[PDB]
Each structure stands twice: as structure tokens, then as C-alpha cells.
Amino acid sequence: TRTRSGSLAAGGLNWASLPLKLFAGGNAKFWHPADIDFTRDRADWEKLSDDERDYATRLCTQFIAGEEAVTEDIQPFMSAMRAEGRLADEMYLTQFAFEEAKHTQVFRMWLDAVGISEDLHRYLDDLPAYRQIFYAELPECLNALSADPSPAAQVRASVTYNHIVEGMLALTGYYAWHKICVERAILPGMQELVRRIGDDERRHMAWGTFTCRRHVAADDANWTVFETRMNELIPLALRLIEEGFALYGDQPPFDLSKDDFLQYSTDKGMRRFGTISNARGRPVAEIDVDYSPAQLEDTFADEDRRTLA
Amino acid sequence: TRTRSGSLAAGGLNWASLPLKLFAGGNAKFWHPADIDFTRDRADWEKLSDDERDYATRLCTQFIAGEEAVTEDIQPFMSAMRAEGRLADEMYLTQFAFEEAKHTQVFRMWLDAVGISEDLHRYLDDLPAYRQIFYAELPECLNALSADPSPAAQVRASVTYNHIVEGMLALTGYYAWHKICVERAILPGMQELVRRIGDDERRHMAWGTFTCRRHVAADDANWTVFETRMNELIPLALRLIEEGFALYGDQPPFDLSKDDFLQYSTDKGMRRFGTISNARGRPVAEIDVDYSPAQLEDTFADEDRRTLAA
Numbered sequence: 001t002r003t004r005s006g007s008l009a010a011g012g013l014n015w016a017s018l019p020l021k022l023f024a025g026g027n028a029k030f031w032h033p034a035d036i037d038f039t040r041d042r043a044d045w046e047k048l049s050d051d052e053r054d055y056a057t058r059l060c061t062q063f064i065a066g067e068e069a070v071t072e073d074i075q076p077f078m079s080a081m082r083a084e085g086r087l088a089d090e091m092y093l094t095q096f097a098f099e100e101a102k103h104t105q106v107f108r109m110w111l112d113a114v115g116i117s118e119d120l121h122r123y124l125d126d127l128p129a130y131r132q133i134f135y136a137e138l139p140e141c142l143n144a145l146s147a148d149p150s151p152a153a154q155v156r157a158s159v160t161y162n163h164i165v166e167g168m169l170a171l172t173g174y175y176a177w178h179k180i181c182v183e184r185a186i187l188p189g190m191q192e193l194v195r196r197i198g199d200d201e202r203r204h205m206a207w208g209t210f211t212c213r214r215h216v217a218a219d220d221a222n223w224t225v226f227e228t229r230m231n232e233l234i235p236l237a238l239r240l241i242e243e244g245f246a247l248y249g250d251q252p253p254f255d256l257s258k259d260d261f262l263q264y265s266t267d268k269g270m271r272r273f274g275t276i277s278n279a280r281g282r283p284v285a286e287i288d289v290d291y292s293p294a295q296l297e298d299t300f301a302d303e304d305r306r307t308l309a
Numbered sequence: 310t311r312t313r314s315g316s317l318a319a320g321g322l323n324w325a326s327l328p329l330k331l332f333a334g335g336n337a338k339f340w341h342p343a344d345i346d347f348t349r350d351r352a353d354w355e356k357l358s359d360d361e362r363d364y365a366t367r368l369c370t371q372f373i374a375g376e377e378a379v380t381e382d383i384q385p386f387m388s389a390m391r392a393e394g395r396l397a398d399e400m401y402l403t404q405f406a407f408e409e410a411k412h413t414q415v416f417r418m419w420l421d422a423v424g425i426s427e428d429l430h431r432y433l434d435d436l437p438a439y440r441q442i443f444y445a446e447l448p449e450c451l452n453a454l455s456a457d458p459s460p461a462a463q464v465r466a467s468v469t470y471n472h473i474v475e476g477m478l479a480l481t482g483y484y485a486w487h488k489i490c491v492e493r494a495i496l497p498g499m500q501e502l503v504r505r506i507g508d509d510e511r512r513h514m515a516w517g518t519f520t521c522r523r524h525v526a527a528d529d530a531n532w533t534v535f536e537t538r539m540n541e542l543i544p545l546a547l548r549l550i551e552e553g554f555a556l557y558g559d560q561p562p563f564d565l566s567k568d569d570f571l572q573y574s575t576d577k578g579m580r581r582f583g584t585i586s587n588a589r590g591r592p593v594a595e596i597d598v599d600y601s602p603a604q605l606e607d608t609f610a611d612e613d614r615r616t617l618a619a
């Protein structure tokens with residue numbers, strides 16, 4: 001079924017290309033889960049109330065279940081790239097998939113360190129919107145790539161995975177861990193965990209930005225494809241946040257505000273249009289070798305850290 | 310399409326399971342391609358004959374094409390595990406796949422560091438047996454898993470990928486690099502590269518052993534499946550080595566002996582049979598949590614180093 005090898009081509013691999021830059025950067029930024037000290041977090045964990053632990057278990061459950069979902073649901077995109085003959089994108093997606101496995105590993109290591117061994121499916125039960133995104137929308141949109149690796153489907157898939165799950169919901173998730181851990185000077189492991197995954201997640205967001213950009217740049221009809229999926233998904237994501245808060249009667253532990261999160265989340269969502277729009281008109285041959293989507297993600301992380309202080 | 314999350318299960322993930330054990334140690338044994346010093350290599354590379362550089366370029370072309378092939382052809386196996394619902398296997402295979410991309414990366418780094426920018430396809434022209442393994446058997450057998458994730462097909466895929474490509478063809482290639490570099494005290498980059506990817510390869514073969522083992526333990530018909538595939542592939546694998554030597558008149562550069570490599574390859578090939586057969590009769594529940602496929606791969610690698618002192 002194979003007739004040729006990308007790595008045997010003239011000039012070889014293009015080290016300037018966006019997906020290879022991200023790949024090189026993931027190698028330089030690699031971290032070990034065994035290096036995270038978890039030996040302090042159980043002491044903190046027990047000094048919390050029955051209600052504080054309920055929220056934190058429910059957030060961790062949404063995380064690890066979401067981490068697992070992405071480790072699985074990225075394979076079709078890898079398959080699409082193999083089919084499309086894009087070796088650089090393909091190689092990066094291996095690192096992508098591996099990174100998601102490592103996040104799934106490390107959240108499981110935290111649950112074990114705080115001594116949670118019971119079945120956790122019940123924490124997603126009161127969250128019908130969570131399951132709509134992670135058991136339904138994420139895999140169905142991504143698996144559609146196996147039948148239809150069309151530019152339109154790749155955008156719809158990227159929007160769903162990269163821009164909403166990672167770009168909007170995960171960042172919102174991290175903000176929740178900031179409010180829980182940093183403000184109350186607790187759970188140093190979870191903090192180091194959230195830092196380290198946050199780091200990996202930035203190359204992921206960069207990649208989603210790259211993918212949507214190159215498609216928009218080549219055929220401007222795809223902008224509308226991007227727009228529409230974003231518009232379907234934002235209300236669903238906001239809904240997830242509301243349900244999490246409504247469970248605690250809008251007045252939750254850790255002094256968390258419903259409207260604070262809704263404003264914080266929307267900001268992460270809308271900011272995605274800006275990432276993609278500047279590709280309209282630009283030539284594809286520049287989008288390939290353009291590092292900016294990774295830069296944008298650095299300055300986004302920068303702006304986020306500034307906002308906290 | 311998803312109804313449950315494996316990581317939310319009671320007891321969580323089984324850290325004792327073989328695929329998670331390899332993942333853990335993959336993390337610990339992670340290496341950076343940017344740590345490998347390639348500077349010294351172009352100095353040695355230019356002090357070689359034309360006949361020497363040809364063989365070395367032909368071996369590297371076969372390697373870097375082989376690495377790329379495995380990076381592509383393993384995605385179906387991931388899909389199979391996703392379908393069979395085996396999370397520990399999935400997780401490991403993501404690291405597996407990533408490793409292959411990093412080997413592809415690092416061979417290309419080498420080719421750059423020595424000054425090779427020409428199209429390298431012309432080096433697989435005279436190797437029809439290479440193109441049969443890597444452009445036909447490997448993808449066609451592995452892509453079969455997307456339509457048919459059955460035990461039989463998984464055994465057939467693992468035999469192709471892990472037991473022959475990795476277990477027999479890759480180790481023979483490493484041996485070639487040993488006889489080329491270590492013996493002639495040249496190419497310290499290629500050397501560091503070869504032992505570093507070798508470290509990864511051992512976990513890949515360990516997984517290959519685990520996969521075939523758990524299928525044979527559960528159904529003894531899968532032994533015959535294993536046996537049949539191995540018997541198909543071995544001849545083709547020796548063919549590859551014979552074609553590669555016959556290009557240099559059986560008398561190639563670096564003083565490489567054809568019969569030496571056939572006997573060396575054969576040994577790597579046959580040892581695979583013994584790796585899987587001891588699972589016959591054994592309980593499947595034991596194999597899931599048994600680390601010996603990774604131990605065996607360590608004692609094999611140790612046995613190989615020892616052989617070299619001769």
C-alpha cells in the first residue's frame with residue numbers, strides 16, 4: 001500500500017515546519033511523572049471538609065476522564081495524516097498522543113497518592129454536558145475523520161479537540177486548580193502536575209491553531225466551517241461549567257464564583273477566533289514554516305499568568 | 310460511541326500490568342536527540358572510500374525508511390486496542406509510536422550531520438525484498454487490524470512488526486553498525502544513536518512478546534497462527550540480507566561476511582519461537598501482570614553484548 005518514504009526525499013525533513021518545531025520542543029520540554037513529589041498532598045487532602053473533597057474529586061474525575069478521551073480520540077487524526085501523506089504532522093501527533101497518555105498516568109498517580117480507589121463514574125453522573133462532550137461530541141467528530149479526512153472535517157475535529165476541549169475547557173480546569181491549590185497553599189503535587197501538563201497542552205493548542213490555519217489559508221470556505229463548529233461548541237462548554245456549579249447550589253466550596261468562571265471560560269473560547277483569522281488571505285507555503293501559532297500560545301500563557309497576579 | 314472510562318475504574322490502573330510497566334520505564338529511559346553529539350561524525354565520514362560510504366548510506370536509508378514505516382504502520386494496532394478496550398496497551402503504544410518518530414528524527418539528523426541531502430529512494434531500487442517487507446507485508450498485515458481486530462490477526466501483525474522487523478531485521482542492522490563503527494573506532498554519533506534506539510527497541514520487542522503470549526495463553530490455536538507467520542517471514546528476511554550483500558559481489562566493504570550475517574540473523578529469528586511457546590498452558594491472568602517478557606529482552610541484550618567479546 002506504500003510507494004515512497006518522506007524521510008528519503010530531497011532535503012529530507014523540513015526542520016522549519018510548524019509541526020516539527022513543536023515535536024523538537026516537546027523533546028526538549030519532556031518531564032517525568034516520577035519526578036513529582038506526591039508525598040505531601042495526602043496530609044493536605046485530609047484537612048479539607050467533606051464538601052471541599054467532593055468538588056476536587058469531581059474536577060479530577062472530569063480531568064482524567066477527559067485526558068483518557070483525548071489519548072483515544074486523537075488516533076483518527078493520526079490516521080488522517082497518514083492518509084494525507086503529511087509525515088511531519090504525523091510524527092508530532094505521536095508525541096501528542098504519548099503526552100495525553102502521560103497526563104492520564106499522572107492524574108491517576110495523584111488519585112492514588114490521596115488514597116482514592118473507589119469507582120468514580122458517579123461523579124460524572126450529575127454532569128450530562130460533560131458526557132455530551134467527552135463520550136459523544138469528541139469521539140464522533142474525530143472518528144468521522146476515518147471515513148472523511150476532508151479539510152472541512154479536519155477543522156471540525158481540530159475545533160472540537162484543540163480549541164474547545166484544550167483551548168477552553170482545560171484552561172478553565174487549570175484555573176479551577178489554581179483557585180483550589182495556589183490560593184490555599186495546598187496540594188503541591190497537583191500544582192506541579194497542573195504546571196507540567198499545562199506546558200504540554202500549549203504545543204497541542206499551537207498544533208490545532210496550525211491545522212485550522214493551513215486549511216483556512218488554502219480554501220477560505222473553511223473559515224465558515226471553523227466559525228460554525230465553534231458556535232455549536234461554546235454554548236455546550238459553558239453549559240458544562242454551569243452544571244458543575246449548580247450541583248453545589250451555585251454557592252460552591254473554595255469560594256468559587258459561577259460568573260467568574262463563565263467570564264473566564266468565554267474569554268478562552270473567543271480568543272480562538274483571533275488565532276485563526278489572520279490566516280485568511282495568507283499563502284499556505286508560509287503557514288507551513290511559520291512558528292507564530294506556538295508563539296501566540298506562549299504569549300497567551302504569559303497573559304494568563306499576569307492576570308492571576 | 311464511548312460509554313465508560315477505564316481510568317475511573319475501581320482500583321484505577323493496574324501498575325503491575327506489562328504494558329504499563331514498559332510505559333513507566335520508557336519514561337525513565339527517555340533520551341533527547343539534541344544530547345547526541347554529531348560533530349565528530351563528518352570528519353570520519355569523509356576519510357572513508359566511495360565503496361564504504363555507499364554501503365553505509367544504503368544501510369541508513371534502509372533504517373530510516375524502516376523506522377518511518379513502523380511509525381505509520383503501528384496506528385492500526387492502537388486502533389485495535391481501542392476497539393478491544395485495552396487502555397494499558399493503548400497508553401503504551403502511544404509511547405511506542407512516539408519512539409519510532411524520534412528514531413526517524415535522529416537518523417535524519419545523522420544524514421544531515423554528514424552532508425547527505427540527495428533523494429535516497431534509489432538505494433532501495435536494487436532491494437526488492439526490502440520493499441516487500443516494508444511497503445507491502447508490514448502495512449498490509451497491520452492495516453488488516455482496522456477491519457479485523459481478532460486475536461489471529463493481532464498475532465500476525467505482532468509477528469511482522471515486533472518479531473521480524475524489530476526482533477530479527479533491526480538487530481541485524483545494529484550488528485552491521487557495530488561492525489562498521491565500534492570496530493573501526495569511527496562515527497561516535499551513529500554509535501550513541503544506535504545504542505540509544507536499541508534501548509527503546511527492547512521495550513518494543515517486550516510488548517511484541519506480551520501481545521503474542523496473551524493470545525496464545527487464551528487460545529492455543531494462536532500458536533499455529535504465530536508459527537505460520539514466522540515461517541512465512543523468516544525466508545523473506547534472509548532474502549533481504551542476501552540481496553544486500555549480492556550488490557557488492559558478496560564481498561562488500563567493512564570486511565562484512567555474508568554467512569556471518571545469515572547465521573546472526575537466523576539466531577535472532579529463531580529465539581522468538583521460544584519467547585512465545587512457554588505461554589502455552591499458562592493462565593491469561595498471570596500473563597497480564599508478568600514482567601518476564603521485559604526481563605527476557607534484557608537477558609537477550611546482555612547475551613548479545615557478551616557474544617561481541619570474541
Ligand SMILES: CCCCCCCCCCCCCC(=O)O
Pocket residue numbers: 059062063066067070103165166169170172173176201240241244245261
Ligand atoms: C467547573 C469547572 C470546569 C472545568 C472543566 C472540566 C475539566 C475538563 C478537563 C478537560 C480535558 C483536558 C484534555 C486535554 O488534556 O487536552
Ligand SMILES: CCCCCCCCCCCCCC(=O)O
Pocket residue numbers: 368371372375376379409412474475478479481482485510513549550553554
Ligand atoms: C544489509 C544488512 C540488512 C540490514 C537490515 C535492514 C534494516 C532493518 C530495518 C529497520 C527496522 C526498524 C524498525 C524499528 O525501529 O522498530
Ligand SMILES: [Fe+3]
Pocket residue numbers: 379409475509510513
Ligand atoms: Fe521499534
Ligand SMILES: [Mn+2]
Pocket residue numbers: 067070099100103197201
Ligand atoms: Mn492533556
Ligand SMILES: [Mn+2]
Pocket residue numbers: 376379408409412506510
Ligand atoms: Mn525504532
